[PDB]
Each structure stands twice: as structure tokens, then as C-alpha cells.
């Protein structure tokens, strides 16, 4: 396009330069409008662009005749070629490059189903102020470029969130987000997909790809059935002992329902135990005023004092309730919930 | 103390600042990767503080960002005032008021440039970022103007390029959230800044004429005549009452119509699309006393 | 990762842009700067003795300007100063530059236009009296180009010889700085590749 | 394969283009070349005796040019030369061509414009003295067109008779060469068809 455009422009400017200087043979060459070559180049760019100032124009008969034929051809040539050239330049990939790790601060790679609302809900529950002073950075990785609302969301979190466009299957893109030094990798799922076995297949393929690059990473993922969760244990690097957890939504939603089949309303309490909610004070006397005080509690994890070692489990739950105002539920030296008075507090 | 045209000192200060810092950065990246071949921290903590201050994540960051917005428009207005002045002229700093206000604006831009330098991840990518190049061609030569007690309307038209920042620093302040009006402020900022900047360049070129005729091509245009020239040209009207007469002026106009015609034809109907999208049948029904009404829903077509 | 980053790619693009800008500006200055300057140097610095000094009486129009854009058009008388060349040794006219020659070829000197026609006439008479004193003696280091304007002899060339310096200097400076940017970026990348692969 | 190739199709297209170009250029030259030339030949070559030679004193403006684009406007006096026609036998003016007549109808001769108004006046006086010597005798082979300009008599026609040759020649040459291309390509194809089908 550039060769045809510039050659047609310079050639037709040369022809109108020859015609306008050596004037019309019918007046015995008294029509010599003395134009330079560059004035004719400027004439044709003003003409092709349909600006047409009129400071410079062809005055001879042969000059006007060529200009009639030139606008019949050259106007369509300009209007077709110039926006296409500007399309072919300027196609630059925006979110290229690579993540640069910093010392003394770890980071997190998030892949999978990344949209505006999923990232918004994630950044609400992750960067909540009810945690401690967290300092992990959140690196995203999605092949689709983000729209303007996601870019405004990433500008709202300019120091905590970086985006990088790539595919998790391609190992060069895994090398770009520093997946070898990431603390964990999170795979969000499109929970309202049209074919659940299809996206379970796709997310299983994502786990295979990340474990193919680096096997010693901690992968957290979401599955939509239980048999597709069973396929993940067959992967030779899927080690749940170090923390490869598969959050199966079918198993968890039906188990929450069944535990509420025993004690009605437990599933609401359990689901509220993980959404990070600050305290909301209600001045009236509604059911929401006491419900929201139940909402503001979250499940946490902590080691115990040395002063509690050797005591019994009902003893330490009673005294932390009355002195520290905390409700202890379970223990770890396994993960069994609510032991009797016969089991004593181990150290650590 | 007239006669000596010291216009070159301003342009030299801009070029030395841009290219000298560029060479210092590149030489740092060669010496620190020669040092092995041939022969949480605290700086990250001040980097995260600057990165918080550049965004609007605090109160003082919000105050800084609103100051960047307001003083960018203020520096542009000072260019509009100074554009009617002659090209090379003297001014005493203690008597010229607008030189003092311009001093206050550019020392603020110097501190904000320092914050953006600290907050960046890549010093080379920051040094080639377009909002830094505007600072390299505007912030040094006003300090040279206060040192010489002499002004030159040089590349002060690049102050109009600061309006590119407006959609970003409104995205920081939670003012722009949805995608349509993010896109609308983006199109408006790029359109107006390109129009005003290119008008300033053709104003400088057309006034200080061609150096090949020993500057006998001074078509004395005002700044607003060049703004009117470029709007007549971009729209492909082209009256011919006002046009560029110098060689450098026509040369820039050739490059400007190659770019600016596609910019006008793409951006203007899209802007007019994003405005004017008003919901027609909004509002609510207002009941009247002593007369009841009927709500009809479902399959509503013309024939039904 | 043995590949350019975004900043190094943009820096290579900047260095290539400065290389193209230096070549294109040299290409522009060849037709704008160089060619009329070489036409100026085509005129030969020669000797000339003054032949005579004449007035015609046909006055011409200057344009005096006040502060707030006045366009007053005063008038001024004309003096023709004819000289005897050393090269052609013919009846040649005297001119101050090509500027005075092109605005009015029929005179030898155009004053700075003032408001009073008496003041313009006095500027003519002072310059004419100086060119009426030194007659015959001290042949002048004047300039002449018999191939284009063989009838007129100038007193000063329009373009300095340092024009030829600045026409070739700053495109070359632009070329050198652009080459230095591409070289330094490539050298920094290759040394960083070797420094990371040395472990 | 009994069909045109791509080269023969392009050659037939070229020959058809030259046929169209010859017809269109003849159509263009009919309005540009032919019609003012036929208006020239409409003027009749006649005889004329010189009546008298007058000056008016009303001077007019010429434009003398130096080498590097001077636009000096010297002035020149006017001579009217009146003749006695052979056809109409009325008071008619003399002119050198339509060019001199259209730039200034009120004179009979315009000199080449020089710098000095004295030199233009001397060119007028030499041409006037030649047209003051030969008075009454030797009636001139002049030209005249009473239907359009019955008051002015020219000395030379603007267009030659060979204009009528070149107006019809090169469109005909273009037509003949285009016809020859189409004929030779079709003849070469048909002979190649017969030469391949002869086996
Ligand atoms: C690719 C990189 C290459 C760049 C090349 C850079 C090199 C630049 C060039 C280099 C050399 C130029 C300096 C030499 C000057 C010589 C002195 C002189 O001529 O005095 C003249 C000052 O006349 C004026 O009035 C000056 C006013 C304009 C000055 C501002 C120039 C800005 C040029 C645009 C800046 C655009 C910057 C664009 C930036 C993007 C007086 O002459 P005169 O009185 O009028 O003559 C009368 C004739 N007479 C004597 C017969 C009567
Ligand atoms: C389809 C095919 C057909 C093509 C047709 C080709 C046939 C071509 C034509 C054929 C005939 C033309 C030749 C005859 C000339 C006659 C002599 C003459 O007139 O002298 C004149 C030379 O005046 C000049 O100054 C000449 C300078 C221009 C010459 C270059 C011509 C290029 C034409 C464009 C080439 C484009 C090529 C385009 C190619 C694509 C002098 O006359 P005068 O002094 O000024 O008169 C003063 C009046 N007065 C006497 C009263 C004062
Ligand atoms: C968003 C931010 C808003 C935009 C920021 C805009 C900043 C520009 C402020 C202009 C200040 C200024 O020009 O001072 C002028 C105020 O003269 C006046 O009277 C102006 C009245 C309004 C102040 C002084 O001009 P002067 O009166 O001519 O000075 C006397 C000189 N003299 C003694 C030679 C006469
Ligand atoms: C000197 C100028 C004086 C200082 C005034 C500068 C305004 C700064 C706005 C900051 C702000 O309050 O944003 C808040 C609301 O803001 C809005 O949603 C609407 C804000 C007004 C509309 C834009 C006006 C410009 C954002 O907070 P939130 O999201 O609504 O919670
Ligand atoms: C003054 C600037 C303030 C702009 C207000 C922006 C705004 O409020 O957005 C609103 C109007 O939607 C728009 O975007 C219209 C704003 C166009 C102003 C363009 C200014 C830049 C032009 C530069 C020319 C400089 C010339 C200098 C010479 C809508 O915002 P929103 O996306 O819907 O936000 C979510 C809803 N919320 C408001 C409830 C939170
Ligand atoms: C050029 C015009 C640029 C401003 C036009 C404009 O922003 O209109 C806007 C406000 O506009 C107003 O409410 C104030 C009217 C100011 C228009 C006159 C400016 C001069 C109209 O915008 P909107 O359609 O009402 O809101 C949609 C914006 N959104 C999609 C971001 C929510
Ligand atoms: C002679 C000296 C004076 C000359 C006068 C100067 C003429 C004006 C030149 C300044 C205009 C360039 C700035 C600009 O257009 O932004 C561009 C850079 O994208 C960015 O956002 C900036 C990143 C760098 C944004 O546009 P884009 O990215 O290139 O592509 C648009 C595609 N898109 C709409 C899908 C995004
Ligand atoms: C919206 C905000 C509007 C901002 C508008 C700026 C005010 C206009 C200034 C007018 C002015 O200064 O007159 C000066 C020149 O003026 C002219 O001669 C040209 C006519 C003005 C061009 C109009 C373009 C509007 C720019 C688009 C708007 C900006 C884009 C949007 C930006 C947000 C004075 O003229 P003068 O020196 O005395 O001589 C002139 C000769 N004359 C007298 C024969 C005429
Ligand atoms: C990129 C590469 C850039 C190549 C640019 C070529 C250098 C320009 C030469 C200028 C010049 O020679 O001046 C001559 C004429 O000039 C003019 O009078 C017309 C003004 C120039 C037209 C600009 C068109 C640019 C062509 C688009 C670029 C090419 C397309 C891209 C190709 C790759 C000298 O003028 P003059 O004889 O003394 O008389 C003029 C009258 N005046 C003094 C009143 C003005
Ligand atoms: C990249 C380029 C454009 C940077 C700017 C360099 C040029 C334009 C500048 C820097 C050095 C300057 C020169 C310095 C010395 C000479 C002689 C002196 O008595 C007055 C100024 C004068 C005549 C200047 C002309 C312009 C100048 C040549
Ligand atoms: C970008 C920053 C860090 C560096 C900018 C370089 C500036 C400060 C330097 C480089 C060129 C210098 C000029 C060089 C020569 C002139 C004329 C001389 O008689 C006095 C100093 C004066 C007026 C200087 C002013 C300051 C100056 C403009
Ligand atoms: C006045 C100007 C020129 C000062 C220049 C300071 C430059 C040379 C120095 C100061 C701090 C440096 C940075 C320090 C650490 C970062 C992150 C690292 O992972 C890659 C290099 C990088 C990006 C360096 C690039 C060069 C750098 C920006
Ligand atoms: C000239 C410039 C460097 C002046 C800036 C002063 C710097 C050294 C001071 C002023 C503000 C300070 C910051 C204030 C609070 C933040 C968050 C806190 O949780 C840890 C320390 C940290 C990150 C501080 C680091 C040092 C600091 C950045
Ligand atoms: C001719 O010109 C030179 C200067 O170029 C001068 O010095 C010399 O005296 C002149 N020669 C004669 C013979 O006049
Ligand atoms: C003066 O001019 C005449 C002719 O104009 C010439 O023959 C002679 O050489 C010249 N003499 C001098 C001293 O220049
Ligand atoms: C008239 O013109 C012819 C030339 O065409 C000339 O030979 C002849 O002498 C003239 N006739 C008379 C009677 O003068
Ligand atoms: C001269 O002119 C007169 C009238 O102007 C006319 O009657 C006569 O025929 C002419 N005589 C000659 C010899 O041309
Ligand atoms: K148009
Ligand atoms: K038009
Ligand atoms: K037009
Ligand atoms: K027009």
C-alpha cells in the first residue's frame, strides 16, 4: 500500500509539473504557470485529501484535464489506502512484557475465567481490610484483552494488581508471569457455563499445563462436578499434601444443603463465614440488625499460647470465650472438630 | 538588552535533559551488566509510597491529582496568553506576574515528575513515556527563561498535550467507571489535545518564517487563526482564506492532513454517537385523583 | 528470557526514528539550504571600480510601520550606481543584496522606510554623497555572476559559508545520536544475556 | 487450447486503448487546435497601404526580467500606425499579432521590455522611423477579418498552415498503430491455431 500510494503521488505530481510549466501548445506556450515540483506534490496532496485550498491550482487546459482524470482516480485511492495504512500501523499489543519480581514480597498468579465481575468479587474478598497487612501482589493472565472497565479497575488497584495478556497453556506466557517464583496459582471457573464437562476439561488442561512447567507450585482451582475432581488426583504432580486444593462446587453446594437438612439454616451461616464483611451498624430494630452482627464474623486460623498447653479442650474454649471473646471451633493433632474433655492441648 | 537571539538555549536545555538522561540510563544498564561479565527493601518502600501517591488511593494523593488537573489547564491558559506576544522578548521576573505563576506551575510539575520517576518499575520505559517527554520540553526552558530574564515562545504548545492524562486521572478519582464515558473522555482528550498542539506548531512555524529566505516568510498569524485553520482543514472544507504560506508550514500541513483527516473522520461521529444516547420513554406515571388507570404488559406490538 | 523488553524495543524504535529523521532532514536541506547557497557561491568574488552615480526622478514606494500595525506607504527617490567590473569590465549596476535587487531592480539602494518623505530623501542623499565622494579610487571587493545576472553587481553575499556547516552538521548529529541509542541498547541487552547465562 | 493467452489479451487491450486514445485526442484537438486555427484562416490575406503614423504620449507598462526572477516594470511610449485597407479601404490600425493586440489594443508595436526606459523609447523610435520612411509605397501582404475585428489589421497570422497537418496527423498515427497491434495479434493467434491443428 505504501509503495503504490507514494509512487502514484510522486508520478502524477511530476506529470502535472511538466504540463503546467511547459504550457498549452494552443496559445503558443503563454500558459507557463511556473510551479516547482514540490508545489505540485503539495497540490496533489491538498487535492487527494479533498481539502482544496485554491492557493495553488492548475491553470492550463491540459492541466485541468489531467486534474479531472486524477480526481476520478486519486480520490478513491486516497480514501481507500490511507485508513488501511493507519490500520496496519498502530496494531501494538498493549499488555505485553513480563512481571518483575521484587525481593521480600511474594506474588500470586490468577488465571481461568477472568471477567469484570469475577475480578471485582475476587479483589473484594482478597484485599479486604479485615485481614492482616497483606503484601502479596496479584498477577492476572488472560488471553482476551480487557475492556475499559477492567482497565479502570486495574487503575484503582495500581500497586496491588498487574495484568499480563497471555495463554496459560503456552509456557512462554507462564515464564512471563514468573510462575516459577509465584506463591500459588488460582484458576477461576465460569460457574454458569453452558457445558460443565467442557469447562471442567479446560480447567483440567490448565492444571496439566502449569504442572508441566513447574510441578512444585500450589494450584487452587474450581471444579463443577465430582468425577472431574477425581481426574485431578491422577495427575502425577497433583500433591494435595502441600496444598493443591480443588474446590468442587457440586460437592460443596450439596454438602451445605445436607448439613442444613440436619440443622436448618446452617448453609447461610457457613457461607457467611467466608465472605469478608466489615461490621455494619443498624440503628433500627429489625431482623437485619442482629443478622448483620452475625454476618461480620469470619473463620480464622491461629496457633495457641504456651499457657494453654496441657489444658482440656472445653477449658480453653470456655476461657477464650469469656476472656478473649473468641469462639474456638476445631483444633490441629489432626483436623478433628470439637474433641472431648479427655483430649488435652498439645504444644503447637 | 535586545539584539541577541538566545532562542537556542531553551531548545538546548530540553534536548540535553531528554537525551542526556537517556544516555545516563543506558550507560547505567551497560555498566551494571559489565560488572559481572568483564569484572523487603527500603527503596521499594519509597517506590510503593510514590506509587500510592501517583494514584488516588489516599487523601493527599487525591489532592495531588486534582492539582495536576487544574494546573495543567492553568499552564495551557498561560500559553494562550503568551502566544500573542512577540517571538523573542525580555521580561523581568520580579515585575512580570505571569512568569511568576508559570514558575509556580512548573516547579509543581517538576515535583510531580519526580514522584512519577520514583514510582515507575522501568526507568527506561518511564523516560520514553509520552507524558515525560512533555515535561522535558516544557519544564526546563521556563527555568532558562527565569535565568536569562528573557522569554521565547518556543515549544510551549506541548503544554496542550497534558490533557491526555485527564481520562486516567479521572479513572483514579472514581469519576469515570462505565465503558462508554471512559471512551468518550478518551476520544475528547485526544481530539482536543491533537488539535491544539498541531495548531501551536503551525503557529510557531508560520510566524518565525523559513530560515532559507533569512526569515522573510513571516505570515503573521495569531494562535486562534491557526486553530481555525486546522478545523477548516481537518473537516476537509478548506476555504482558502487562511493557509500556510511557508515551506515548513506546507510540509507540516501535508503530514497533518495524512494523519488528521483520518483522526477527524473516525473520532467525530463516534463522539456524537456517545453523546445523545438518551433513553426516550423513561420517567414514571403520575396518577390523578378520581380516575383509575390500567397497566398493560406482555406481548406488545403494533397490531396487538 | 533472552529477548527485548518493551522499553528496549521502544528505544530501538526511537534510535531508528532519529536515523530516519537525520537522513530525511539532510534530504530536505539539500533542496532548501544547499542549492540556493551553492547558487550564491557560484557568484564570484571580484573587483569593481565605480563608474558613475545617477538619479532618475522616478520615485518608488516603501512601507513604514508604527507600533500597533500601521501600514503607511511613504515614497523614496531612486539612485542608480553604475560600476565598472574587473571580470566583464562592462556597465554593471550596484546592489546591496539580492533582497534589494528583487524588491526593486531599478535602484542601487532602498532606505529603511520612515514616516516623512523628507527623511527618506535625506537617507538617499547621505548614501549618495558617500558614493559620490569615493569615485575612481579603491576598487571594491564585490560579487558577480555573469551566467545568471550579468548586469548587476552585489555588495554582500546572502548566505554565509557557515550555512554549509550547519546544513551538514545537525543531520549528522541526529544520525550519530540515533546510532548511539541503537548500539547502547543492543549492547546492554547482550551483556545482560551473558550476565544471566553466566550462572 | 484455441484461445488468447494473457499477453495477447493485454496486447489487444493496448491496441484498443490506442484506438480510443487516437479518437479522443482528435476530439480534443478539434476544440483546442482546430477551431481557433480556423478562426485564424477566416481572416483574409489582403493588401494595405499605410495611412499615417501617430504618437499619443500615453505611455504603458512593460515588464523586464533579470536572471533570478526580477519583476521590474519599465514603461514605454505608444505609437499608433493607421493603414488604408484594400478590402474595406477604411481607417484600420496595424498590429504585429493577436498577442500584441490583446495585451494592448491602443498601440501598433510593443517592444521587448528592458531595464532602461530610454532603451524602450529608442526601440519605439527605431521601429517608428522604419514605418515613417516607407509611406504610401509597397502595399503590405497583411491580414484582416471584417466580421470580428474590422478595425485592426495584422502583420502575421498566429497559426501556421502546418498546424492543420499536425492536428490531424498524430491522432491518425495513433489510430493506425493501434489497429496494427490488434490485427497482428489476431493474425498471429489464428496462424498458430492453424499450425497446431495441421498435425
Ligand atoms: C533535524 C534537526 C535539524 C534542525 C535544524 C535546526 C537549525 C536551525 C537553523 C540553524 C541556523 C539558524 C541560526 C542562524 C541565524 C543567522 C543570523 C540571521 O540570519 O539573522 C537574521 C535574524 O532574523 C530574524 O528576524 C530572526 C527571527 C527568527 C529567529 C527564530 C528562529 C527559529 C527558526 C525555527 C525554529 C524551528 C525549530 C523546530 C524544532 C522542531 C537577520 O537576517 P535579516 O535581517 O532578516 O536579512 C535581511 C536581508 N538584508 C540583509 C539584505 C536586508
Ligand atoms: C495523442 C498523441 C498526440 C500528441 C500530440 C503531440 C504533438 C505536440 C505538438 C506538435 C507541434 C508542436 C511543435 C511546434 C512548435 C512550433 C514552434 C513554436 O511555436 O515556437 C514557440 C516556442 O515556444 C517555447 O517556449 C517552447 C517551449 C516549450 C516546448 C516544449 C513543448 C512541450 C509540449 C508538451 C509536451 C507534452 C507531451 C505529452 C506526452 C504524453 C515560440 O512561439 P512564441 O515565441 O512563444 O510566440 C510568441 C507570439 N508572438 C510571436 C506574437 C510574439
Ligand atoms: C485554573 C487556573 C486559572 C487560570 C490561571 C490564569 C493565570 C493568569 C493570570 C493573569 C495575571 C496577569 O496577567 O496579571 C495582570 C493583571 O491585570 C488584570 O487586571 C487582569 C485581571 C484579572 C487578574 C497584570 O497585567 P498588567 O496590568 O498589564 O501589568 C502592569 C504592567 N504595566 C505597568 C506596564 C502596565
Ligand atoms: C478545585 C475543585 C474543587 C474540588 C472538587 C473536585 C471533585 C473531586 C471529586 C472526588 C470525589 O468526591 O469522588 C467521589 C464521588 O464523586 C462523584 O461521584 C461525583 C463528583 C462530582 C462530579 C464530577 C465533577 C467534576 C468518589 O467517591 P465514591 O465512589 O462515590 O464513594
Ligand atoms: C470537567 C471534567 C469533569 C468530567 C466529569 C466526568 C463525569 O462525571 O462522568 C459522568 C459523565 O460522563 C462523561 O464522561 C462526561 C464528561 C465529559 C467531560 C470531558 C472533559 C475532558 C475534556 C478536556 C477538554 C479540556 C479543555 C481545556 C481548555 C458519568 O460518569 P460515570 O462513568 O457514569 O461514573 C459512574 C456513575 N457515577 C457518576 C454515579 C459515579
Ligand atoms: C462537546 C460536548 C462535550 C460534553 C458533552 C457531555 O458530556 O454531555 C454529557 C453531560 O453533559 C452535561 O450534563 C452538561 C452539559 C454540558 C454540555 C456543554 C459543554 C460545552 C451527557 O452524557 P450522558 O448521556 O447524559 O451520560 C452518559 C455518560 N456515561 C455513559 C459515562 C454514563
Ligand atoms: C512535529 C512535532 C509536533 C507534532 C504534533 C504532535 C501531534 C500529536 C502527537 C501526540 C498524539 C499521540 C498520543 C496518542 O494519540 O495516544 C495514542 C497512544 O496510546 C497511548 O495511550 C499513549 C501510550 C504511549 C493512542 O492511540 P493508539 O494507541 O496509538 O491506537 C488507537 C487504537 N485504540 C483506539 C484502540 C486505542
Ligand atoms: C470553547 C472555548 C472557546 C475558546 C475561543 C477562544 C477565543 C477566541 C479568541 C479570539 C481572538 O483572540 O481574536 C484575535 C484573533 O482572532 C482571529 O482573528 C481569528 C478568529 C478566532 C478563531 C476562532 C477559533 C475558535 C477556536 C476553537 C475553540 C477552541 C477549541 C476548544 C478548546 C477547549 C484578535 O484578532 P487581532 O489580533 O486583533 O487581528 C485579527 C484580524 N481581524 C481583526 C481582521 C480579525
Ligand atoms: C519525507 C521527505 C520530505 C521531502 C520534502 C522535500 C523538501 C521540500 C523542498 C522545498 C523546496 O524545494 O522549496 C522550493 C519550493 O518549495 C515550495 O515553494 C513549496 C513548499 C514545499 C511543498 C512541501 C511538500 C512536501 C512534499 C511531501 C514530502 C514528499 C512525500 C514523501 C516522499 C518520500 C524553493 O522555493 P522557491 O523556488 O525559492 O520559490 C517558492 C516561492 N516561495 C518562496 C514564496 C515559497
Ligand atoms: C538538535 C539541535 C537542533 C540542537 C540545537 C543546536 C543549534 C540549533 C544551536 C546550538 C548552538 C547554537 C549557536 C551557538 C553560537 C552561534 C554564534 C553566536 O554568536 C550567536 C548564536 C549562534 C548563531 C547559535 C546558532 C544556533 C545553534 C547552532
Ligand atoms: C536538562 C537539564 C538538567 C540541563 C539543561 C542544560 C542548561 C541548564 C544549560 C545547557 C546550555 C546552557 C546555556 C549555554 C550558554 C548561554 C550563554 C552564556 O553567555 C551564559 C549561559 C547560557 C545562557 C546558558 C544557560 C544554561 C544552559 C541552557
Ligand atoms: C537523572 C536521571 C538520569 C536518573 C537516572 C537513574 C537510573 C539510571 C537508575 C535509578 C534507579 C534504577 C533502577 C533500579 C531497579 C530497576 C528494577 C530492576 O528490576 C531492573 C532495573 C531498574 C529498572 C533500574 C533501571 C535504572 C535506574 C532507573
Ligand atoms: C524527597 C522525597 C523522597 C520525600 C519523601 C519522604 C519519604 C522518605 C518518606 C515520607 C512518606 C513515608 C512513608 C509513610 C508510610 C508508608 C506506609 C507504612 O506502612 C510503611 C512505611 C511507608 C512506606 C513510609 C516510607 C518512607 C516515606 C516514603
Ligand atoms: C582584486 O581583488 C582582491 C581581493 O580578492 C584585491 O586584494 C586585489 O587588490 C584586486 N586586484 C586588483 C588587480 O585590483
Ligand atoms: C571600464 O569599462 C570599459 C568599458 O565599459 C572597459 O573597457 C574597461 O576595461 C574598464 N576599465 C576599468 C579600469 O575598469
Ligand atoms: C494584392 O495582394 C497580392 C498578394 O496576395 C499582391 O501580389 C498584389 O500586388 C496586390 N494587388 C494589388 C492590386 O495591389
Ligand atoms: C484610402 O482610404 C479612403 C477612405 O479612408 C478610401 O476611400 C480609399 O479607397 C483608400 N485609398 C487607397 C489607395 O487605399
Ligand atoms: K472536501
Ligand atoms: K473541500
Ligand atoms: K475547498
Ligand atoms: K477553496
Residue numbers in the entry:
A (entry chain B): 238 to 569, 577 to 592
B (entry chain A): 16 to 54, 91 to 355
C (entry chain E), D (entry chain F): 2007 to 2205
The paper states:
The Slo1 channel, also known as BK or MaxiK, distinguishes itself from other K+ channels by its unusually large single-channel conductance (~10–20 times greater than most other K+ channels) and dual regulation by intracellular Ca2+ and membrane voltage. Because both Ca2+ and membrane voltage gate Slo1, it serves as a hub in numerous physiological processes that couple membrane excitability to Ca2+ signaling events such as muscle contraction, audition, hormone secretion, and neurotransmitter release. Slo1 functions as a tetramer of the pore-forming α subunit, which is encoded by a single gene, Slowpoke (KCNMA1). In this study we present the structures of a mammalian (human) Slo1 channel consisting of the α subunit alone and in complex with the brain-enriched β4 subunit.
The final protein sample of Slo1 co-expressed with the β4 subunit contained both the α subunit and the β4 subunit confirmed by SDS-PAGE and mass spectrometry. Structures of human Slo1 in four distinct states were determined: Ca2+-free and Ca2+-bound α subunit alone as well as Ca2+-free and Ca2+-bound α-β4 complex at resolutions of 4.0 Å, 3.8 Å, 3.5 Å and 3.2 Å, respectively. Due to its highest resolution, the atomic model of the Ca2+-bound α-β4 complex is used for most of the structural description and analysis in this manuscript. The protein sample contained high concentrations of Ca2+ and Mg2+ (10 mM each). As expected, the channel adopts an open conformation and both Ca2+ binding sites (the Ca-RCK1 site and the Ca-bowl site) in the gating ring and the Mg2+ binding site at the interface between RCK1 and the VSD are occupied, as observed in acSlo1 under the same buffer conditions. Four of the β4 subunits bind to the human Slo1 tetramer, extending the channel extracellularly by about 40 Å when viewed from the side. Consistent with disulfide crosslinking data in the literature, β4 subunits are located between voltage sensor domains (VSDs) and each β4 subunit contacts two neighboring VSDs simultaneously. The 120-amino acid linker between the two TMs (TM1 and TM2) of β4 forms a well-ordered structure on the extracellular side (termed ‘EC domain’ throughout the manuscript). Four EC domains form a ‘crown’ on top of the Slo1 channel. In our Slo1-β4 structure, β4 associates with the α subunit almost exclusively through the two TM helices.
